[PDB]
Every structure is written in C-alpha cells, then in structure tokens.
C-alpha cells in the first residue's frame, strides 16, 4: 500500500517481455546518447528526459538499447547532480509548504503533511547514506535547505 496513506492505487508502467525491440527504431545508442547529454546540458532529470524521448524520439527506454541506465550515463559523462531528484523534489515540496506555513500558522494539514515529507526525506536519506552516494552525515536541515535545492 501507500507509505503515508491508505492508498491502494497501482498505476504504473508495464514493461514488455523483451530486452530489445523496436525493430523499427534503427538509429543508434550513440546518437541517442548524444541527445541524452544535450538534454542533460539543458539540465533535466532522467525522468522527464525519458518521457521526452518516449513522446518524441521513438524511444522505448534507454535501459534496452544502450545497455545502461540514464543516471549511469550522466555519471559517466560528468553530468550527475550532487544529489538525486528524489530528495531534490521532496525538498522543494517541503520548502514550499514551509513558506506557506510561515504566512498561515493556522493551516494544520500543511504541518501534518510536512512531517510526513520530512520523515520520507530522513528515511530515504538513511538509504542513500547507507549506500554512501552522499557524505555520511549530510543532515537535511530545513532552514538551510532552501539554498541547497536552490
């Protein structure tokens, strides 16, 4: 089920039983990768990048055709962010809610959802600090958190 709610929704991507394909694609992993790096230089995330290449560039997913994942490619080319998008967007969310709270002390629901968010952040941070992709402490502090994500 859902982490911080009773939700039981299951909308997601159903990958096909295939590790190649399309036959109809016929361009190159390399030219695709050139496109990848270009849109990375534009400063997008793997998520919207793959969305773009789905909607426009005939791409199923680079997992198939390149033999690598997006974040791996960006790492190889030196385009990796300092942090992952997960924390990035979560922190944006927390900060926005915090700014809302600053001018609405009485909104209780925002307060509630904030600690939900921060607990997500802390657990996920334990994960990433376990895998050592971060410095071992890093301790998201919501006060300074603004200029981190920004």
Partner 1 sequence: SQESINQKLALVIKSGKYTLGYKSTVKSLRQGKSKLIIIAANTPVLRKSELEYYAMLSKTKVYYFQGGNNELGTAVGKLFRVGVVSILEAGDSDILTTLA
Partner 2 sequence: TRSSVLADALNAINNAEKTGKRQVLIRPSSKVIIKFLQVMQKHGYIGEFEYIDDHRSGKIVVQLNGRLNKCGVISPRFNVKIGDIEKWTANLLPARQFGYVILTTSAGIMDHEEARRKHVSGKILGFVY
Partner 3 sequence: APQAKILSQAPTELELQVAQAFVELENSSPELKAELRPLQFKSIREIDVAGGKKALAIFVPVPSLAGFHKVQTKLTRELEKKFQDRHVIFLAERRILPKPSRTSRQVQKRPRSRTLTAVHDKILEDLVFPTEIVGKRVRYLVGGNKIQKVLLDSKDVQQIDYKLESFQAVYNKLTGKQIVFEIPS
Name the residues that contact partner 1, by CB under 8 A. Answer: 41-43, 144, 146-147, 150
Alpha-carbon gap, residue 30 to 36, rounded angstroms: 9
Closest distance to partner 3 from the beta carbon of 59 (Å): 18
What 8-17 contacts at long range (C-beta under 8 Å, 24+ apart), as own/partner pairs, is none
Q: Which residue has the tokens 């992952």?
A: 84
Number of chain residues interacting with partner 3 (CB under 8 A): 4
Does 17 participate in binding partner 2 (rule CB under 8 A)? yes
| Least distance from partner 1 to the Cβ atom of residue 43, Å | 4
| 3-state DSSP assignment of residue 86 | helix
Is 21 a binding residue for partner 3 by CB under 8 A? The answer is yes
71-130 positions binding partner 2, by CB under 8 A: none
Cβ(94)–Cβ(145) under 8 Å? Answer: yes
Using the minimum distance from each CB to partner 2, give the nearer residue, 2 or 103. Answer: 2
18: contact with partner 3 by CB under 8 A: yes
**Radius of gyration of the chain, Cα coordinates, nearest whole angstrom:** 19
Instruction: Provide, rounded to whole angstroms, the least separation between the CB of residue 20 and partner 2.
Output: 13
Residues 6+ apart with CB under 8 A from 70: 36, 46, 49, 50, 62
Contacts with partner 2 by CB under 8 A lie at 15, 17, 19
Contacts with partner 3 by CB under 8 A lie at 17-18, 20-21
């Amino acid at each position: 089920g859902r982490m911080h709610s009773a939700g039981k929704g299951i909308s997601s991507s159903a990958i096909p039983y295939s590790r190649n394909a399309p036959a109809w694609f016929k361009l190159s992993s390399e030219s695709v990768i050139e496109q990848i790096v270009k849109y990375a230089r534009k400063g997008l995330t793997p998520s919207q990048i793959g969305v773009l290449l789905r909607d426009a560039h005939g791409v199923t997913q680079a997992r198939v055709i390149t033999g690598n994942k997006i974040m791996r490619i960006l790492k190889s080319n030196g385009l990796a962010p300092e942090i992952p998008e997960d924390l990035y967007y979560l922190i944006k969310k927390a900060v926005s809610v915090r700014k809302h709270l600053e001018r609405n002390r009485k909104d209780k629901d925002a307060k509630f959802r904030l600690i939900l968010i921060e607990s997500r952040i802390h657990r996920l941070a334990r994960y990433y600090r376990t895998v050592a992709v971060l410095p071992p402490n890093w301790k998201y502090e919501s006060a300074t958190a603004s200029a981190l994500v920004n």
